[PDB]
Design an enzyme around this catalytic site. Structure first.
Site, mmCIF file in Angstrom:
data_model
loop_
_atom_site.group_PDB
_atom_site.id
_atom_site.type_symbol
_atom_site.label_atom_id
_atom_site.label_comp_id
_atom_site.label_asym_id
_atom_site.label_seq_id
_atom_site.Cartn_x
_atom_site.Cartn_y
_atom_site.Cartn_z
ATOM 1 C CG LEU A 130 -1.850 -1.231 1.306
ATOM 2 C CD1 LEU A 130 -2.508 -1.290 2.669
ATOM 3 C CD2 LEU A 130 -2.891 -1.158 0.202
ATOM 4 C CB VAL A 139 2.662 0.598 4.255
ATOM 5 C CG1 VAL A 139 3.193 -0.458 5.227
ATOM 6 C CG2 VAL A 139 1.237 1.004 4.593
ATOM 7 C CE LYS A 164 7.654 1.509 14.861
ATOM 8 N NZ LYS A 164 9.094 1.348 14.560
ATOM 9 C CB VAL A 176 -5.168 21.158 27.838
ATOM 10 C CG1 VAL A 176 -5.781 22.489 28.171
ATOM 11 C CG2 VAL A 176 -5.234 20.232 29.036
ATOM 12 C CB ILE A 223 -1.302 22.522 26.334
ATOM 13 C CG1 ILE A 223 -1.941 23.336 27.462
ATOM 14 C CG2 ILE A 223 0.102 22.041 26.687
ATOM 15 C CD1 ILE A 223 -1.939 22.625 28.783
ATOM 16 C CB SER A 261 -16.657 15.244 10.366
ATOM 17 O OG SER A 261 -17.117 15.954 11.500
ATOM 18 N N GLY A 275 -16.459 16.118 15.672
ATOM 19 C CA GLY A 275 -15.599 16.611 16.762
ATOM 20 C C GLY A 275 -16.009 18.014 17.164
ATOM 21 C CG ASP A 306 -15.120 22.555 11.341
ATOM 22 O OD1 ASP A 306 -14.416 23.169 12.195
ATOM 23 O OD2 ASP A 306 -15.272 21.332 11.340
ATOM 24 C CG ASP A 356 -12.708 25.958 14.347
ATOM 25 O OD1 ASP A 356 -12.234 26.659 15.274
ATOM 26 O OD2 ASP A 356 -12.517 24.724 14.227
HETATM 27 C C1 LIG Z 1 9.641 2.636 14.123
HETATM 28 C C2 LIG Z 1 11.109 2.397 13.799
HETATM 29 C C3 LIG Z 1 11.846 3.701 13.612
HETATM 30 O O1 LIG Z 1 11.470 4.175 12.340
HETATM 31 P P1 LIG Z 1 11.671 5.818 12.129
HETATM 32 O O2 LIG Z 1 12.918 6.580 11.060
HETATM 33 O O3 LIG Z 1 10.950 6.816 13.383
HETATM 34 C C4 LIG Z 1 13.365 3.511 13.689
HETATM 35 O O4 LIG Z 1 13.763 2.421 12.854
HETATM 36 C C5 LIG Z 1 13.839 3.244 15.109
HETATM 37 O O5 LIG Z 1 14.182 4.503 15.678
HETATM 38 P P2 LIG Z 1 14.049 4.825 17.261
HETATM 39 O O6 LIG Z 1 13.401 3.597 17.867
HETATM 40 O O7 LIG Z 1 13.190 6.082 17.330
HETATM 41 O O8 LIG Z 1 15.507 5.033 17.637
HETATM 42 MG MG LIG Z 2 -14.462 19.733 12.645
HETATM 43 MG MG LIG Z 3 -12.995 22.792 13.793
HETATM 44 MG MG LIG Z 4 -3.578 18.723 21.370
#
Ligand SMILES: *CC[C@H](OP(*)(=O)O)[C@H](O)COP(=O)(O)O
Ligand SMILES: [Mg+2]
Ligand SMILES: [Mg+2]
Ligand SMILES: [Mg+2]
Ligand SMILES: Nc1ccn([C@H]2C[C@H](O)[C@@H](COP(=O)(O)OP(=O)(O)OP(=O)(O)O)O2)c(=O)n1
Ligand SMILES: [Mg+2]
Length: 326
Positions: free
Chosen positions: A53, A56, A63, A94, A97, A171, A180, A183, A247
DNA sequence: GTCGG
DNA sequence: GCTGATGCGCC
DNA sequence: CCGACGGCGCATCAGC
């Protein structure tokens, strides 16, 4: 349902990269991968199947192999156990933040709901409202309440000036059964790409909505964008409705189709569509679609008479709002 | 983290 | 006060 | 390998 385990895993990794790592391209990569896996109409049996895909790659396939064999990701199991990651992931829930402010607060020993309510003097106006409505803002709005909210906003705007048109986007316009937040895209003939023939066009609408007690708070306000809080009225003896985010975006009347494309989203769809436009030699924003010159300098706005015209320029088959969700 | 030149 | 950088927000 | 990754509004702050 389908591949929910994988997409939840990828969303939690996205949130970690955005909130803790402050790695916005890894956040976007995880979310793009989650979205393409969500739309895939088979139960993914291996990392190799998923790797076919778009969005990916090798790391996400590995993973997916871990997750499918063990039902867990060691990396997320560690992050969940980390006090600093945990604290930052909580504070960024929040409104107001962000990743930077969350890390600052953790540094000052402010890291729980109790700590925030003790330290309101340390919060800006936006953060104070995010804290006040923390519970309310994590609730979704049923479509039936969104229809009630639509009816108040369209009827109040009409009472200000019969020439305003208010369109509920996000949405809601993609046909979601829950939203959520609300808008609202606003146009008035007095505000075009060529002229502002009238001041306070957004202000007058916000003021009317405050006067009928629909808008309860303001997070931010300028000439073209309002960000705030609203609430449906409740009946005698009824529990009050939760406070909701609203919004409002005032868009030049002649740039409605670019504006409604932008405000209908989803955000992932907009990122995908704008990234496809660039590959096709165009740039899209909420106002215009423009060619890119040999330079990499945007040229003059192209004529747009429909949402579909924008799709036609970038050689995409038209997608109804309902088909632009994740 | 992934993709395309 | 103005301008440019950054944070947080929106889809 | 490696540069690009969507695009912009409002709030806040540093430097002049
Ligand atoms: C998920 C595996 C990570 O892929 P990315 O370039 O964020 C890395 O292979 C592992 O990196 P770390 O676990 O963040 O050191
Ligand atoms: Mg919205
Ligand atoms: Mg909104
Ligand atoms: Mg946030
Ligand atoms: N302290 C550092 C680290 C890196 N860089 C630069 C050198 C490279 O142009 C780029 C990254 O080089 P790396 O060796 O870090 O390459 P990767 O990021 O691909 O490897 P790693 O797996 O170590 O992250 O940043 C730098 O200027 N100073
Ligand atoms: Mg349309």
């Amino acid at each position: 349902t389908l591949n929910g385990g994988i997409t939840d895993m990828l969303t939690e990794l996205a949130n970690f990269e955005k909130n803790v790592s402050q790695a916005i391209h890894k956040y976007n990569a995880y979310r793009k991968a989650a979205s393409v896996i969500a739309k895939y109409p088979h139960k993914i049996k291996s990392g190799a199947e998923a790797k076919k895909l778009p969005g990916v790659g090798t790391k996400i396939a590995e993973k997916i192999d871990e997750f499918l064999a063990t039902g867990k990701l060691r990396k997320l199991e560690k992050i969940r156990q980390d006090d600093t990651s945990s604290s930052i992931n909580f504070l960024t829930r929040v409104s107001g933040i962000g990743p930077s402010a969350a890390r600052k607060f953790v540094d000052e020993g402010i890291k729980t709901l109790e700590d925030l309510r003790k330290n309101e003097d340390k919060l800006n106006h936006h953060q104070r409202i995010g804290l006040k409505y923390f519970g309310d803002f994590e609730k979704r709005i049923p479509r039936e309440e969104m229809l009630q909210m639509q009816d108040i906003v369209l009827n109040e705007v009409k009472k200000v000036d019969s020439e305003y048109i208010a369109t509920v986007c996000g949405s809601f316009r993609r046909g979601a059964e829950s939203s959520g937040d609300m808008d609202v895209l606003l146009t008035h003939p007095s505000f075009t790409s060529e002229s502002t023939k009238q001041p306070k066009l957004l202000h007058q609408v916000v003021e009317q909505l405050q006067k009928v007690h629909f808008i309860t708070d303001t997070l931010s306000k300028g000439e073209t964008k309002f960000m705030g809080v609203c609430q449906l009225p409740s009946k005698n003896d009824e529990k009050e409705y939760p406070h909701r985010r609203i919004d409002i975006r005032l868009i030049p009347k002649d740039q409605y189709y670019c504006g409604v494309l932008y405000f209908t989203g989803s955000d992932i769809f907009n990122k995908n569509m704008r990234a496809h436009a660039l590959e096709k030699g165009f740039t899209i924003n909420e106002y215009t679609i423009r060619p890119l010159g040999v330079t990499g300098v945007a040229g003059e706005p192209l004529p747009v008479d429909s949402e579909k015209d924008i799709f036609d320029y970038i050689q995409w088959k038209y997608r109804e709002p309902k088909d632009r969700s994740e």
